[PDB]
């Protein structure tokens, strides 16, 4: 297990444009295309991202390429964020994957709402953090995925992603 296998479980893999849990056009392994309701706007984003006229379909290789870019960009965003970097750097590698998972799903702007959780994680109060993390729109809207990410922060193991 690692961040790539973890997000591949959580996000799936679809080679045609679909709508994510929030209703937004998406492709591949959870690559958000746009928040616009325009399918044409999404297809345009996809063509820009892949570098060819795709007609709304990509290959597995192309999906994995976008995914690798997306994970990298997520982590580099964390390391440029004065609020997030110190918490990330405080964590072990397993918990760092859980942090990237959150940013991948909700963005830095979503994670901005979790200041009190992030403090508890920096303090290594794992059970308290887990409770605070679940008091969220995130948990209520995607509970099974949030439970897996939260278990990862709580335990510092991959137990939620085995089987
Ligand atoms: C950096 C980014 C996202 C995060 N979620 C929990 C801790 C943490 C640190
Ligand atoms: Na992808
Ligand atoms: Na992706
Ligand atoms: Na886990």
């Amino acid at each position: 297990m690692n961040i790539f296998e973890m997000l591949r479980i959580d996000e799936g893999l679809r080679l045609k444009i679909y709508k994510d849990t929030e209703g937004y056009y998406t492709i591949g392994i959870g690559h958000l295309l746009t928040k616009s309701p325009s399918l044409n706007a999404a297809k345009s984003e996809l063509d820009k991202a892949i570098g060819r006229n795709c007609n709304g379909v990509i290959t597995k290789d192309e999906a994995e390429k976008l995914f690798n870019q997306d994970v990298d960009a997520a982590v580099r965003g964390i390391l440029r964020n004065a609020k997030l970097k110190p918490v990330y750097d405080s964590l072990d590698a397993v918990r760092r994957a859980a942090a990237i998972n959150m940013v991948f799903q909700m963005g830095e702007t979503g994670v901005a709402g979790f200041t009190n959780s992030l403090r508890m994680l920096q303090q290594k109060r794992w059970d308290e953090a887990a409770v605070n993390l679940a008091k969220s729109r995130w948990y209520n809207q995607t509970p099974n995925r949030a439970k897996r990410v939260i278990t990862t922060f709580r335990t510092g193991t991959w137990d939620a992603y085995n089987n």
Side-chain angles (χ1 to χ4, degrees):
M1 196 52 55
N2 54 57
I3 184 55
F4 293 89
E5 298 187 14
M6 185 202 202
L7 277 167
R8 171 64 187 75
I9 290 166
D10 285 333
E11 293 292 348
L13 169 62
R14 303 181 66 189
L15 299 186
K16 305 174 177 182
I17 295 173
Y18 68 98
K19 291 176 181 182
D20 71 7
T21 69
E22 294 290 351
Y24 301 137
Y25 293 120
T26 300
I27 200 160
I29 307 163
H31 184 80
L32 171 70
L33 289 167
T34 185
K35 295 184 183 186
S36 167
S38 171
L39 178 59
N40 283 327
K43 282 176 179 182
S44 181
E45 289 293 305
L46 180 56
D47 296 350
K48 182 162 45 80
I50 305 299
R52 68 184 175 80
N53 176 353
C54 65
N55 193 14
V57 187
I58 65 178
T59 70
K60 187 174 180 181
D61 287 351
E62 289 169 339
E64 290 178 339
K65 186 172 174 134
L66 290 188
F67 181 48
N68 295 348
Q69 293 175 167
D70 293 340
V71 174
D72 185 359
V75 190
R76 290 301 294 278
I78 288 166
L79 297 177
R80 279 184 209 108
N81 186 312
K83 283 160 191 186
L84 302 180
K85 185 184 183 281
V87 184
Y88 182 84
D89 277 354
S90 82
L91 299 170
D92 60 277
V94 173
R95 293 184 177 98
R96 285 182 179 166
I100 296 159
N101 192 308
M102 296 190 70
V103 167
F104 190 102
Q105 180 183 0
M106 292 179 312
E108 296 176 32
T109 67
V111 170
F114 284 84
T115 305
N116 297 329
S117 305
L118 264 68
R119 183 182 306 102
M120 296 180 195
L121 294 169
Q122 191 164 358
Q123 297 171 311
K124 304 196 179 290
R125 293 176 182 194
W126 306 129
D127 278 21
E128 290 173 82
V131 165
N132 185 256
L133 281 161
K135 297 176 173 167
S136 64
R137 174 176 189 278
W138 171 63
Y139 177 89
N140 284 99
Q141 304 298 133
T142 49
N144 288 330
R145 186 197 181 149
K147 284 173 191 172
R148 287 191 290 279
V149 176
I150 294 168
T151 288
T152 310
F153 283 120
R154 191 180 47 84
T155 67
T157 76
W158 295 111
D159 290 352
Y161 288 88
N162 294 339
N163 325 319

